[PDB]
Write a protein that binds this ligand. Structure first.
Ligand SMILES: CS(=O)(=O)Nc1ccc(C(=O)O)cc1
Length: 182
């Protein structure tokens, strides 16, 4: 509908796949080469389904900060025959607050879904499903089951992936450029 939705759509149309684990179907962001991200609660194993194709997992790393606190981001390298467009230059370098973000989801349950979530707070610490978690972003939208893995964007920046909610607020794990130096 406007330039925020334009940037979100450009990311969804080239840099997302549908990931299926034994814990459900997730929006999955591809970042570069065969490297993608997914919430750590997806419990990625040795095999994952990518757009309903059986795919070997070459590597999976559940990120934690240097205090050994959960970040809720798993970086997955996929045995896929095709690379993602490199979008690492759209990742923020530092923790920050944002205005006017969009949350975008693409699954069997929620195809071509875009939500203007408004202002995004650097919330920091969250007890997420009982797990102490750091680098959480918060937005005041009543997000629902089916949205985990959804991509959080502003114009020109890919800032996080949706990992939870409390009924009135939604929570995303930050994406930082430093996670994807190779
Ligand atoms: C599932 S549980 O919450 O009962 N036990 C856990 C699991 C994971 C972590 C973590 O830091 O990743 C902490 C506690």
């Amino acid at each position: 509908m406007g330039p925020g939705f334009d940037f979100a759509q450009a990311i969804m149309k080239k840099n997302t796949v549908i990931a299926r684990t034994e814990k459900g179907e997730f929006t999955m962001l591809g970042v570069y080469d065969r490297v993608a991200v997914i919430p750590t609660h997806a419990s990625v194993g040795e095999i994952i389904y990518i757009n309903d194709v059986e795919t070997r997992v070459l590597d999976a790393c559940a990120l934690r900060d240097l205090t050994d606190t959960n970040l809720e981001i798993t970086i997955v390298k996929l045995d896929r025959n095709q690379k993602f467009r490199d979008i690492r230059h759209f990742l923020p370098r530092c923790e920050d607050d944002y205005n006017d973000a969009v949350l975008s989801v693409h699954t069997s349950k929620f195809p071509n879904m875009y939500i203007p979530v408004g202002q995004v707070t650097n919330y920091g610490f969250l007890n997420l499903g009982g797990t102490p978690t750091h680098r959480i972003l918060m937005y005041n939208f009543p997000t629902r089951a089916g949205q985990c893995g959804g991509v959080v964007t502003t114009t020109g920046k890919v800032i996080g992936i949706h990992v939870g909610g409390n009924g009135a607020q939604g929570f995303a794990a930050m994406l930082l450029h430093s996670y994807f130096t190779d």
